[model samples]
Target chain A: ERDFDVVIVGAGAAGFSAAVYAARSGFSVAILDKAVAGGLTAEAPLVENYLGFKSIVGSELAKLFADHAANYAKIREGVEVRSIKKTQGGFDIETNDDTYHAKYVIITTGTTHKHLGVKGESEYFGKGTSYCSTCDGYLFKGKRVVTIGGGNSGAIAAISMSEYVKNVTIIEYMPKYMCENAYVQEIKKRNIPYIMNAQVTEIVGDGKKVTGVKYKDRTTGEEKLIETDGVFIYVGLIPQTSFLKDSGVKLDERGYIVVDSRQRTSVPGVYAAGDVTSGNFAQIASAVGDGCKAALSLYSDSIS
Target chain B: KERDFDVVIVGAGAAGFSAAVYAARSGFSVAILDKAVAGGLTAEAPLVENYLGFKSIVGSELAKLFADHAANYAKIREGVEVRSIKKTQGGFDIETNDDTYHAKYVIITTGTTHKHLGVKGESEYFGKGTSYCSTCDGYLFKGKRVVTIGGGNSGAIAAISMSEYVKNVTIIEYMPKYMCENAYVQEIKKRNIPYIMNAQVTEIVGDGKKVTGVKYKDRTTGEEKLIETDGVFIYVGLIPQTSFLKDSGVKLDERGYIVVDSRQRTSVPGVYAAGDVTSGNFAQIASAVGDGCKAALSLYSDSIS
Candidate 1:
């Protein structure tokens, strides 16, 4: 196993920030990601608040962050971490490619978009189901579809799809819209239809790809079906922290890593940052700051 | 009587910029006022390599980035000096040089500056090859000898920085050994930089116009010594900028740093402090940014009615 001073799992704003900070602090650093750096950040259409760039697209900002870390931290992409062990000397990160040993570990793997887990949802796949409207929305151009979940992301997805799609409908499990009033107003202003107090039960579709979404009306106790070209689900996200279950590092009730203000986890020589850790405001600026805090905490540990 | 803004952040340093952005994002109107240009002491640094994102950016360049980014969302009142903050019935009255403003909440990020040596000749020799920032004045001592007073991280860092350009660099520390980061200590020794331990610099030896050497007293031998150098750099310590908060209904430590909780909240309700002004052992741009985020989020959560 190749030993490093720090191993940051996941390479988004959090990991990249930590990598740069650790490297600059004179520590050997590496950032590992299952996919290319950015994750959900790249999916963002626009990010206005992250200090430095007044207004920049998520992908553009992601490129700047990724490229910055690539110079100092070892960048490994297209790799999956199967397990993490708190062994002697430090920790061992067992990945699909190889094993990495590090004196300290900083977990920054953010979160994965939650799957609906309904029958025929995963089976339909690209044929009629999509999680990312930014990538797959245009494919449904001029076609009507049922977008699931009525949260901020789902509502925004519906509004963005309304630009080109013939018709867009929102399905919500809550009695009312969960997103901010501004997005709710825009959704209504666009004349997009929404169904509240409902939940999607299944994405029933023809094997060849014909589709209609099935849902239940909570108040009425009735099952309903809405015909659509495709189903876009944006209910929520699940923290990607299963690999840490066996490790001594502790996770909260929701599976997010438990870290103190200094970013130190339950285990010594282990730290975490961003959404992978608790306190979930989930802003890119805040996550980047967490990475810096994590690196500093790790650096502090060594001197003491 | 009425609030003019949702949040009024004093100081345009990292914490101020970060707090402004976070506050504005949460649908709150914010005004960031700085007595001078925004970016705070960060702009004073020649280069910042530790800040996340970019590997190495000129301190001013990074400041510009923070300013431009935060300005897009919040009102930036650069060059507006805050005279006092008086708590009122509904909010706080922020009296400034040009105008008085009111806000429901106030966050102080006024930060700190380098502490002076308080030694003879330091103030007079300021422009004459005596500097508190090696990164700023190290260039002038190129191919010449320089002496740095203090052996904290900043002092060791200053000595190492001066070593790159100065013909020779030396450190005069009151501590028996360097009490900074081990990495910095190793670098100083790797470069063969010599340091006088358990010594206190008493005066700056120089001609009428420029510095020529430094004079210090040995703690062990009780003997005074002099080291010839072209420049004298001071990196003794830092003092918080909390003098303006005198009787402002805010509590500060005995050392004049704002006494803040982990949430960055000060002694007064609806008031918070972050960055160098806050009483803390560590000083870092990232931590200050984190503190700004926490303070904004804390106010937002508490403001929810």
Candidate 2:
């Protein structure tokens, strides 16, 4: 088995913060992520609350964290962890390529967005339909777009898209639009259109590219089609903890991993941080604090 | 009162700044009062390595960043010492050395100060041979013998770090066992630094301009001893800033630190505390920010309800 002092799963802000601290403390650290680094934070259009740099792009802030972590530890890109088992001394992490042994394990697998199972939604994911507007909003400049879901993400994304796109319309399933009051006021100030109590039936596309969207108004029971150049989905999210379903790590009722004040999981030598853990503020600032504290706790524990 | 606000935070360090930002952003009018310039003890730090975002930044520089972020939304009143806080109808009346105001809530972020050793030649050798920060003044005693007082994490860390620059390092602790993390203990043992336990430092002996040695009394016996050294670093402990809360109905611990719940609230409603003045073990910037954020959010929620 490949040996390492610490093996961190997920290369997001939490994972990277842990890696930087662990490596700086003279531990051999390896950070592995299934997809590209940055996690859900990179999807944020703008970050104004993270202390330093009053305003910065989500992707740019993510890159700074990644770069800082890379200076101290080894970052393994596109590596997915399948399972984690407690061994005699430490733990054995199983992935597709091989099994990695480490004295400590930090799980930062983060969370995944819940997708709408509408027709053609999956096929035209990147063609003309996008899950993260911050990542692909520039491509739809001067074009009409529609955002689904009326929560914070949907409202915020629609506002962001309105800056570059010609027009944006939000289709929400709930009767009352539920979003932050500030965001709702901003949306109204910008004169963005929105529909309530509507359900999307399908993402209509030309088989190769997105062309329009079809939805049904709950009140009138009338099917309507909105011709647009792009569609952004902003539904809720699900924690990415399926890999640890049988690993004996305890999880809360909502499937999010349970962590103490020190960021330690139920099991010894195992820690979890970021969006994957329960009782988090779901903000980048809090996530960074969680990662730093967890790494410090792990470091102190390792010495004992 | 002629003027009123939603929140008035004392101390403009990391915790105070963070609390001000959260409260103001939630549509509350906030004013931060400090007796001196912003940053508190955090400004004197040489290098801050643990706070996320920046890999490494000077302590003063990071304090500037925190202050700038807070200034965007909150009114900062530097060089103002708050005298007392008395409970008023539906709020609290804050009286300072110069002005008085009222607010719906008051957040105490008044940080702590370093404890001083009361002994001969201690005050006389303030900057000559006595120092607190090893990073800032370690160069002066390069290749010279130095003695560090106290056995806590701060003292142990200072002794260990100063060993790299000093010729010989000695630690004098009053307790039998050193109070620090296991890692520091291991490092201290590996370095083979001499530690005199059950010893209390009675005096810092100096020769007119510089330190020459130290005198200590043994707890086991009535015997006193002296050791020659070039510098003395005192890190016994900290005294929390809670003098203004006298008879103010704020609960305090045995050590005089402000008692706070999970959300940094004290026994009284509409009163909160954060940062070093509160009960926090790590005393790091990240932990302070977290506490400040939670306290502000809790206060805002309590206001609406």
Candidate 3:
């Protein structure tokens, strides 16, 4: 239905950066996103590591990138891109509204939070069981909840849930906390108890709703059960590339897109950046740099 | 100078400043040293649009912000060019033009500098009429005609800047088309400045006192012409400022850029390199910011033990 020199998928930090660079290079750009701009960054509460602001809310930073890129790119929000097909000329991106024809495609569709594939995780699902502590912390108001993983996300989630929950506990697979010293101090200040070297084996509940979870002690080889009202999983991320499975793009063992240092994916004319790509630091700064590289590489290849 | 600080960051550009901010905030005693003021080549840029946060900003203003953010935590040793870096027993001793500093780690963000055409009269008329930085020497050529060489972004922006102060300006580029950003090319076109292509400046001609004109060879016709001009602003390209790292046990590439990995680690232990001085995927403000942060964090992790 429409044609452009470059079609940027996902309007997050990487996507916005891609559009900014690609469009600035005199390429016709169309940025498509099923959700609103910002992607996972929009879901974050506060961001400090991102350069420039010193401290800012994730949504506000995302807004700055989106607003900046919007000047050069044709951004389409609330449009779902179902598939990207390699055509005789270039590629055709099928969206809900119409098809987008482009000489190049950049996948910046970041990652969705990975699920805790325990037995009761699917059984309970979002029915009072939450994965995103920031998004669903209110569900366990005046109730006790257990947070899985003790890394940056999980620790931050526990600290945030401390205000609303009756009791918050962190279960990490590692012996020592993997979070930064700041997060460690913050968690310690809250007097939150954490069980280290414990793997959550199953989520147990009454046949209908959730009640508790079961874990195996990695150190002592002992299975233990913790009674909690809700379970918040922040273990890891899964790339949002289910559609790419049929597209023949090579993926890593973790199922993320395979990209070279220049952000070139395994397939020519198709590139990936940000958290969706393999072997990159998952940060706003990293994503911005990767997005810039992908756009520049695509431009260089076109000219060559 | 014995362990003066935990880390000493060289260069005060975007990469150096970003690293200073990160390293200092990470609860380390950090010192940033630069031969000139904190802002590097970024301070001389006309306009910057691609640096993520700001939609459009003057590059000098952005460099100021980066400097301010860095200075809040790190001790910035302005006007101090590091002379030599010698590995010590525990850390390293850095001898600068002003004083000596010993630090646990060092970060090479010295970035780059504009190169000049090694023409006949280039050295003699350096200050009198020939100039590398239009931002510094543009006022001298006020109400006079100046010629800028090179067709890249540097040449494009420097010509645009000099056009503001000079009465007449012409760009003699060796390339047929301008290789800079489209925005800059449009700005030049909008200003109606004559940018001659396929011509290389052969010599900086003068009256033996001050710069008067330039002799150039036109590539198309193989014709040489002597054009009268008040000043010559050169903006060919940049070469890394890594001569200080030479013979300092730091590995450099064939082009003299500091060899660094994705983590910004140099070949020597307790040292790292970032920005245009290192081999990265690309060179830009955003890339510099990322590289500096990564290098700072990498050193912080290394010092954990």
Number of the predicted model whose lDDT against the real structure is largest: 3
Candidate 2, A1-304: lDDT as tens digits: 2689899999998888788777766678999998888888788887666765677888889888888888877888878999998989999999976888999999998888889999889899888988889878888999999998978778878988899899999999988766645567788899998788998999998888899999999888899999998999988878889999679899988789988767889889999988899866566766776787788889878868
Candidate 3 local lDDT, B1-305, one digit each (tens): 33399999999888888888777756688888889888998877777789887987877788888877777768888898998999999799999887788998999999988887988999999898988877777888889988988878778888887788788888988887778767677788999988898898888989899999999999889999988799988888789898887689998888888887667889999999888888643768887887788788888878876
Evaluated on chain B only, what are the TM-scores of all the candidate structures, in order?
Answer: 0.93, 0.85, 0.93
Off by over 4 Å in 3: A137-146, A157-170, A186-195, A201-217, A220-231, A246-248, B1-6, B22-29, B86-93, B98-100, B137-144, B161-166, B205-212, B226-231, B299-305
lDDT of 1: 0.82
Q: lDDT by residue for model 1 over A12-97, one digit each (tens)?
A: 88888888778767799888899887867777656666766676777788888888888878888987787888877788889998
For every model shown, what is its TM-score relative to the native structure? 0.85, 0.83, 0.88
- Scanning candidate 3 chain A in windows of ten residues, the lowest lDDT window is A43-52
lDDT of 1 by residue, B154-237 (tens): 787778766887799888889887666655777888999997799988899788888898889998999998888998888888
The models' CA-based lDDT, in order, is 0.82, 0.83, 0.84
Position B3, candidate 3: lDDT? 30
Q: Per-residue lDDT for B1-305 in model 2, tens only?
A: 23478889988988898888877866688999999988777676656666767877877799899899889968888888888999899699988876887889999998888898888888999898898877668779999999999877678877887898799999999988766655567788999998789998899988898899999999889699999899989888789899999999999998888888655788888999887888643566776776677678778767763
**Span of ten consecutive residues with least summed lDDT in model 1 chain A:** A44-53
Task: Score residue B299 of candidate 2 by CA lDDT.
Answer: 87
Please write out the lDDT profile of model 3 over residues A157-253, one tens digit for every residue: 8887898889999999888877765677778899998889898999888877788989999878899888988888888888888768578789988
Better of 2 and 3 by DockQ: 3
